[PDB]
Design a protein around this ligand. Structure first.
Ligand SMILES: [Ca+2]
Ligand SMILES: [Ca+2]
Ligand SMILES: [Ca+2]
Ligand SMILES: [Ca+2]
Ligand SMILES: [Cl-]
Ligand SMILES: [Cl-]
Ligand SMILES: [Cl-]
Ligand SMILES: [Cl-]
Ligand SMILES: [Cl-]
Ligand SMILES: [Cl-]
Ligand SMILES: [Cl-]
Ligand SMILES: [Cl-]
Lengths: 501, 501, 501, 501
């Protein structure tokens, strides 16, 4: 009551903090841009896989860990670097959030659905992607790269709203487990066992158009083939941007790198390209080079001033596959709701629109990228009213100089378990991941109920979440955090979550 | 059943062990006293906040920890010292039990209900305090000091039965978080955050009479003000006792010290008064002096022979706020069902009724003080029959020389979680608190399910609960411990617990 | 499904993997044996209590831990040694599975029912023991030694199907706790407590015949008496084998040693007989000698060629009672679903039927001994169709040279909690036991929920379960492990488990 | 300079804090006593083995752990209770300190020297016991009970200065390891191994007069014999006190209980005499009764007012032998320099000399008992000048009302390793004992070097030494703590320590 600064706009939309003065600056910047450009703006989402908060140089990594990222760094120094961007703790949960504007517990997309899985419902028949909505108002929409949000009938991007799909229906490790003989020898060198397991082996990169069928476009059956995966994806993103711009149409492209998911096999060009001379760091060099190649293309096509570029990650680093892992200064990693698992890099670049040199610690969510995309295209009013949407339009936050965020709380779920939330700079845990083996967040952990008080970390003072102080310094704020929790869960009674059985 | 010595008297009352010979002695002592005194006895309950089992010198602390307690020692040495007195693990839960005869899971009083809380019904309408029942038979009843059992409309002591209330609706820490700027700087020196949080800042000590309005009798706006808090409470209890004795009516007074809850600020007189010269120890010297002043007042009024004095705590030491913490020799502390959290000091003094120099290890509960009080006033038959009462009348235990307890089992709850029980000298845990940071029982703990066998500690042999032996030496008793658990839970099916929503 | 090699025979029977060629060998071997022998075969089950996987010399113990086991080694080296035999984590549960062919969560026999518990219905009215079915087709069936699956009315072996019973209704520790004064002094030297606890003291060894009353055959009132317990049981098993062979009837005998359950008191002639010179190691030598005596009796009576001998254990070592404990190389022990508690020794010997010198790592369960017995006697078709049976006939697996197992999965329950399963050589934990005090698997453990991924151990590579790799090397098999788990739980939706209340 | 309040009197003597006014009171009390009594005072040292700080009732034990100690409580309540009394971590070391006035690293008496251990020189030829010095000025000196400071030639009390010795040359567990067959079966039931070990079996209690031979006065060949051990010792102290009073000579008697060292076998009449009904608690009752018997003897002979009674322990509880162990609230136990091992109970009773009801937290040491004894007998001026003496005369501390101690610092050694010191209420660790298994302070511990700062505990605020704060609050005092350490080590270069080889 005395703390809640959010206002309910539509009952099925996450309440947002009004920023009227920032909204006026945003509306004005977009009006003048479209006058000069003659059409709606493009959006380029560069989505790296399992990238940690600290991997880019501007976040305290780069040359400090043997993989300088000059292009990503330049994108940040000449734009807006978000230090409190949040994702979900796992691949599918985050990519679902980014393409539905909904916490995955609502949609049922907490785990990838396989081609032979028994489901009572295809969740995508009910969910609405930004490709669907933006397509209807003139955008050419595409997801190029990793999907991992369902590969059964009617679940690929070009089947759920996007005009064009090209990439991996599952994930890198699904391919490499049938390629690195020694690493997976218990299955690879066991003939009887390999005969069974290889029947569910992925074929390669899939290509698909809205209204058409799926096609194998780049088969993968060796390490040499898979080492070119991100080069091939880069080739398709270039062709997609060339085609959309040459046709004078606004485009919306999610470029979903395969890297740096394990097992990383960078292109031969990049073997030893990083000072560290390790596959995952070489892969980071390849990601930084492809990022620069796409920025250069837009600059050469004269569309850089009309393109919002978002560089982010889908979750924290996968320490379980060390040394094939990224780096994050925070506690934990992929598979936990510690900050290591969910606090991720987030860079917003828009030449002429977003002032250079900004570092902003305002709260932001992957679902906010979804909802900002919808507002940029002018289609927020097209969302269904019987579904609850967790995303918040952050246009006023991104386009204002040192603007304040419109999001008040970040809610954190481990699939169907609600575990923690962040309000202001305070991190409140109601369920805690406890790891038995160092680095083994996913594979050797417990999810434990807290005791008398939820764990509380002031992230400004204890960002690495080393020791909880609970109620000691937070008696004034604890009941409000509980109110945020209960209200959040209440929205899931008012709007039932999907059970896909 | 070869073990159960308890007998069902009224179906809605915790079964008690008959002590018929001790009861004859108690009936005779009470009869002769009322014939000589001319009216029912007074009861004075001295309730110290967050005092550990070993804080008083007579329990093994005092001078050993740099804070002598001579007056409290004299109460024990000239009366009865209980070494197996039990409370609830936290403030609100223990204070509800003391004023309702009921484990707080039955009443819903596991958390303090603040103003503006959503509740189906005010739990206190249904509950029956000893103030209500004793006031009905001519007692002047008062609670002076800390309440912390609800501050919304109709929840202060003068609105739930007591004739007079004077003290803190909430708790010391609620006041001090708005006074110690540096300790709470993230809120106090943040202008916008302070403006919001300070709107729920308590104004001071609240004064209230049955049938009247709440008044702010003593404002608290500085450390200087709050440093006198326990001197002001002492003054009010002196006025109350004087007024009741001058009217010739029996008094029932719960003097609920604010000390030694954090943040401790003793009166200026007591700065450096303890050899330790630390706030929490200086506060212990202040509590001991006030105890002696109240005893000396009763002596000067000629009411010591007709006054039962009970000195006790509401829970174990708050180790989380170290070094502003009491001391206990047992494991854990406040916020856990380790012995450190629930095994608390307990002294019964009654000049001419309770023989001096008794140390008794018989089981006793805070709810037993409630039920003992009701019997001394002759009002047990007034308890509603639709509610289960956990308290047991212990008058035959307190008034018998080296008497045996009427309580067979102590049941331990963490709010809505049943975690452990004690039977004879055996502590059986069905859920265990596990602490991740030293001293951080409340703020950095888990509540974990046990494995194949409940944990068992022979408290005579392992009082510090260092390592469980489970079934190894307790096969004969383990099935009975489970029978006690099952029956205890079954009473909550036959007598439903309150859901306040 | 590409992984599932099992086939549904009957809908209420655990699916098995067909082994047609092994089955032909089994059918032919049995037909020729019965031609020369003139009657169905005998089955002698030697069941040692709390014996670890590695206690026998052939399993890496014996002389290595100061207790040679030559006779048991002879059964293994002249027969078939199973290195992946599994039990339940505790006594009652395992013996229920051995005598009902059903995981104890289905029957309700997760705990011993005491003569004085009052249960909705006696589970043995519904459960079908191999004694009932085999006696119906001409077998003389007996259980001699430890029972521990209920001692209330109609729960002893001679009341639930077996023709003859002689042994302990409960367990060794139930007797020795009233005999070893010092070890149990808190109860033994406390007059009041002993008077109550000893009312439930077992009188001695109970004898019973189908259709007859219970009798106290061997009173136990001293260490002297109970030190001969396994010598008495040996004498009874000798009488029973002699009389079945003299009468020309096939016999089914479960010899259930009291050893090596605590507190071990071997016969005087074995004091110091082991090099280690400790009670539990002396008890091991006594067990080995008794094994050799029964085998010699078969050879003397000319029945060794027509007798399948199964040497196995009921659960892993009880480390909590150290140093009165067996040995196992695996993690944990009795009371946990770690391999230490469930992976147990398993030796099958059948002179002339099972080729000597075999070591086989195929999966096998105690319920498979039940189901294999029923097929050897030819009565599998007599099982009720409204009850699910987890046992699998392993006759083709035991009578084939280096044959493959018919069991695809072992399912592991901690009473009512499903915790893990084994498929192929992979151990997958869904709930993990965590021990807070070394050796204290039963008495100081937690049962914790896993985090993002189930814990996975390749037992060939990590047989001691030292650090889980989870999904890292098992992405191809993890969905199939989930399919097994969910299908297993589904069988208990279709066939309800017994709620004994 | 700024902090040191001690003064150097003789260069080979530990400096002491002058207490001139307390010394004036002490000289007057002793003068008036000797006028009325007619001779020098008696001293009775009651020394319990492995007794914890909290075991007596007045220290927070007794009835709270099921073993009341009324006679020991009465000594404290009617005398002076010391809450900061310190010993050494082990038996031999502490008993050396008590009978030499010197930290045992100086004398070489850190381990008991066994018959024929081949030493460079018997260390007792250099040390000067109070028996020797007091005997020269007319005292009858005796040690009755446990010795444990050397069994070789010339090492028993009657050979190193005491007039009379009667008791155990070694320790209780030296006898019982040859009496409890099952507990020590690896040796007892191994014929060849028992034959070897039993050649060093102690034959029983040894008796000796100054200038006479050793004699076997009570043979111990069974549990029956040893169960009376402390009754036999009580008889001898009675005979000794009677003989001294009838001869009119002042007596100095160290009554060294065998209890409560493992394995505890109390007299038959005490079996179950404690409420806990456990051997170690029954033994506590026997010790309390014998204490009361000796006090009543002195009163009956008319010497109570001329007898200083010291009740204390030689070290903390032996948790390794749990449940045959005492109790202490502090961390650790016997075998460590945690407070649990060295902070011991200490009571001083002197009817008419020491005012009743005192509790004093001043620093006190076992070596101070030695030096105080020498003062009372008037023989301090007879100490050699080539040995450094650590003991300090505390007569002014024990005979003053709430007097301050003459000891500034307590230095703590683990045999030859300097580990910690206490100054004021601050405990400073330079080496730390880390315990790998709960309770196993002696048997499963490491001795670790600290890191950048010595560990510091304010014992008033953290008496259980839960978490060190080091320099954080002690920068003003840490350089002084280091000065104390270095000066202490310097005394050992000026006065070299003994190398026994
Ligand atoms: Ca990912
Ligand atoms: Ca409290
Ligand atoms: Ca067993
Ligand atoms: Ca000792
Ligand atoms: Cl604004
Ligand atoms: Cl290349
Ligand atoms: Cl009675
Ligand atoms: Cl003041
Ligand atoms: Cl086959
Ligand atoms: Cl024998
Ligand atoms: Cl002085
Ligand atoms: Cl006796």
């Amino acid at each position: 009551n005395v703390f809640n600064d959010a206002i309910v706009e539509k009952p099925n939309m996450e309440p947002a903090i009004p920023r009227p003065e920032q909204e006026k600056v945003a509306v004005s910047k977009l009006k003048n841009l479209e006058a000069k450009q003659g059409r709606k703006p493009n959006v380029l989402v560069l989505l790296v896989d399992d990238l940690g908060w600290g991997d880019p140089g501007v976040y305290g990594g780069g040359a400090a860990i043997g993989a300088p990222t000059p292009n990503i760094d330049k994108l940040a120094n000449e734009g807006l670097r978000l230090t409190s961007m949040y994702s979900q703790p796992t691949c599918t949960s985050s990519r679902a959030a980014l393409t539905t504007g909904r916490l995955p517990v609502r949609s049922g997309l907490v785990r990838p659905i396989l081609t032979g899985d028994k489901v009572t419902q295809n969740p995508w028949e009910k969910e609405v992607s930004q490709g669907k909505l933006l397509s209807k108002v003139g955008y050419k929409t595409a997801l190029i790269g990793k999907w991992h949000v369902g590969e059964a009938e009617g679940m690929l991007p070009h089947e759920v709203g996007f005009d064009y799909f090209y990439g991996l229906p599952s994930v890198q490790s699904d391919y490499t487990q049938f390629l690195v003989e020694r690493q997976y020898a218990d299955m690879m060198t066991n003939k009887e066992l390999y005969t069974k397991a290889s029947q569910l082996r992925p074929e390669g990169l899939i290509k698909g158009r809205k209204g058409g069928k799926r096609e194998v476009a780049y088969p993968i059956n060796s390490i040499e083939d898979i080492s070119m995966i991100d080069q091939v994806l880069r080739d398709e993103s270039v062709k997609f941007i060339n085609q959309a711009v040459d046709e004078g149409k606004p485009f919306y492209l999610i470029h979903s790198f395969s890297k740096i998911h394990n097992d990383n096999y960078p292109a031969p060009k990049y073997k030893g390209a990083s000072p560290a001379a390790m596959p995952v760091r070489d892969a980071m060099v390849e990601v930084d080079d492809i990022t620069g190649e796409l920025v250069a293309l837009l600059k050469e096509k004269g569309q850089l001033e009309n393109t919002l570029i978002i560089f982010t990650s889908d979750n924290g680093p996968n320490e379980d596959t060390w040394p094939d892992s990224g780096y994050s200064p925070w506690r934990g990693g992929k598979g936990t709701t510690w900050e290591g698992g969910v606090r991720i890099p987030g860079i917003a670049y828009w030449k002429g629109m977003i002032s250079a040199g900004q570092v902003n610690n305002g709260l932001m969510d992957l679902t906010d990228i979804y909802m900002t995309s919808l507002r940029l295209g002018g289609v927020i009013d097209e969302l269904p009213s019987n579904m609850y949407f967790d995303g918040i339009d952050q246009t006023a936050f991104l386009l204002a100089d040192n603007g304040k965020s419109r999001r008040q709380v970040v809610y954190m779920w481990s699939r169907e378990d609600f575990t923690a939330l962040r309000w202001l700079d305070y991190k409140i845990h109601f369920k805690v991941f406890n790891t038995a083996v160092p680095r083994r967040n996913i594979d050797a952990s417990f999810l434990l109920d807290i005791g008398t008080a939820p764990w509380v970390f002031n992230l400004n003072m204890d960002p690495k979440e080393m020791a909880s102080t609970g109620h000691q310094y937070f008696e004034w704020g604890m009941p409000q955090a509980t109110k945020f929790m209960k209200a959040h869960i209440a929205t899931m009674k008012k709007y039932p979550n999907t059970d896909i059985g």
